[PDB]
């Protein structure tokens, strides 16, 4: 089952500048930073709250590491802003299979590594009324 | 203080069809529906989780009631997808004044009515790295 909003994926041109914006404006602090070279992003997670399923909700700020990447292509076309939304589940493999069986395109055969060792997959935005939708199971 | 992600505002052409998509695909159900004629939207709130500040996190699906509205203009330009993000606070007036004092444009002098009697205001996307950002205090 999808039991929380896990995060909002926000694309930006300069991760350090946009991190500073969220810290200065709202008092949000950095929970974690990492590079995902497969995905072609440098990311920062800002934790906003805990959630009733035992998880948490974050802002995931993403700067592309290369133009030839999902986020690099998207920023070039659209400018900075919301790139995707992510829902948390205790079983991404099972939930992804159930959604594949409804005819919504699941972009990975098998979940891939995401933030903080999580396992993630994506649903095609053109099957989700224009919203790139991620499914995530936390490593813990 | 901004203590939760309150909701994701998602624009759609057909509220009933997009509600059905979220119900069929993810098992989300409708928590509330209402029309906001000032804002020019028909909305449905889908509750995803409760949050550690005592509040909750929703998907807010929005269909325009008129072309000449924030969401009608935006859908015509961009197609369906994420329109805004909303953060919850126990004092929208105080937090909005603190953010106005940082030079981020606050679009209302005074918070206006939002979902379920909430009081809301917005920050200009061009001051927030491309993200239309709402601040909301729940009526309870
Ligand atoms: C590490 C991690 C992350 O979140 S990494 C996040 C970055 N990685 C990802 O996004 C991977 C998944 N995304 C993708 O594979 C691709 O970007 C998509 C789903 C396949 C689209 O790739 P395409 O190469 O087909 O892009 P393309 O520009 O060709 O566009 C294909 C269609 O999708 C639309 N589209 C593309 N990106 C979109 C987005 N982010 N949201 C909504 N619509 C989108 C686009 O406007 C076009 O619509 P249109 O036909 O109406 O004009 N984490 O830890 O949580
Ligand atoms: C009831 C409720 C709701 O949430 S009601 C939600 C619907 N209402 C609202 O959005 C009200 C707040 N929004 C607004 O007043 C306006 O839409 C904005 C902030 C002023 C923009 O209005 P404008 O008439 O200036 O729009 P305009 O198309 O002229 O565009 C002005 C600039 O803002 C950008 N922009 C417009 N809408 C945007 C959005 N949703 N996200 C990001 N960028 C946006 C746009 O791309 C352009 O950038 P560019 O210059 O780089 O091209 N609730 O209960 O929670
Ligand atoms: Cl890596
Ligand atoms: Cl009304
Ligand atoms: Co993500
Ligand atoms: Co809203």
A97 and chain B in contact, CB less than 8 A: no
Locate A35 and state its tokens.
């590079």
Residue with tokens 């949000």: A28
Q: What are phi and psi of B138, to 5 degrees?
A: -65, 150
The pairing of beta strand B56-64 with beta strand B41-50:
antiparallel
Judge whether A137 and B87 are in contact, CB under 8 Å.
no
Query: SS3 string of B32-89?
Result: EEEEECCCCEEEEEEEEEEECCCCEEEEEEEEECCCCCHHHHHHHHHCCEEEEEEEEE
Q: Which domain holds residue B46?
A: 1-140
Read out DSSP for A70-101? HHHHHHHHH-SEEEEEEEEES-HHHHHHHHHT
d(C-alpha B82, C-alpha A82), whole Å = 7
Locate B70 and state its tokens.
């924030």
Structural domain tally of chain B? 1
A52 and chain B in contact, CB less than 8 A: yes
Asked if B3 lies within 8 A of A49 by C-beta distance, the reply is yes
CA angle A18, A22, A28 (to 5 degrees): 135
d(C-alpha A9, C-alpha A34), whole Å = 14
What resolution (Å)?
A: 1.5
d(C-alpha B38, C-alpha B128), whole Å = 24
Q: What are phi and psi of A8, to 5 degrees?
A: -110, 120
Across A107-127, b (16+ Cβ under 10 Å) vs e yields eeeebeebbeebbbbbbebeb
d(C-alpha B83, C-alpha A87), whole Å = 18
Way it was determined: X-ray
Judge whether A121 and A134 are in contact, CB under 8 Å.
yes
The pairing of beta strand A133-137 with beta strand A81-89:
parallel
Identify the closest residue of chain B to A82 by CA–CA distance.
Answer: B131
Task: State whether the Cα torsion A77-A122-B55-B24 is positive or negative.
Answer: positive
- Nearest C-alpha neighbor of B129 from the set A78, A6, A48, A125: A78
Residues of chain A with C-beta less than 8 angstroms from the C-beta of B87:
26, 48
d(C-alpha B56, C-alpha B37), whole Å = 24
d(C-alpha B124, C-alpha B106), whole Å = 7
Q: Report residues whose beta carbon is within 6 angstroms of any ligand 1 atom.
A: A 9, 36, 39, 41, 60, 70-71, 73-74, 83-84, 86, 107, 114-115, 120, 122, 124-126, 130, 132, 134; B 81
Asked if B4 lies within 8 A of A104 by C-beta distance, the reply is no
Strand partners, A8: A59, A85
Instruction: Name the strands in the sheet holding A119-123, side by side, starting at the edge strand that comes first in the sequence.
Output: A32-36, A41-50, A56-64, A2-11, A81-89, A133-137, A119-123, A112-113
Asked if A52 lies within 8 A of B49 by C-beta distance, the reply is yes
d(C-alpha B77, C-alpha B60), whole Å = 20
Read out DSSP for A94-139? HHHHHHHTTTPPBS-SS-EE-GGG-EEEEE-GGGTTT--EEEEE--
End-to-end CA distance of chain A: 17
Judge whether A26 and A18 are in contact, CB under 8 Å.
no
CATH number at residue B85: 3.10.180.10
d(C-alpha B8, C-alpha B84), whole Å = 6
């Amino acid at each position: 089952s999808l039991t929380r909003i896990d995060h909002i994926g926000i694309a930006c041109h300069d991760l350090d500048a946009t991190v500073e914006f969220y810290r200065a404006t709202y008092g949000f602090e950095v929970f974690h930073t990492e590079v995902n070279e497969e995905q072609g992003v440098r990311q920062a997670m800002l934790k906003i709250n805990d959630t009733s399923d035992g998880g948490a909700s974050y802002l995931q700020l993403l700067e592309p590491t290369r133009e030839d990447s999902a986020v690099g292509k998207w920023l070039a076309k659209n400018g900075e802003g919301v790139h995707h939304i992510a829902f948390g589940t205790a079983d991404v493999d099972a939930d992804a299979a159930d959604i594949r069986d409804k005819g919504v395109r699941v972009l990975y055969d098998e979940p891939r590594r995401g933030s903080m060792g999580s396992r993630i997959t994506f649903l095609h935005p053109k099957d989700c009324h224009g919203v790139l939708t991620e499914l995530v199971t936390s490593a813990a």
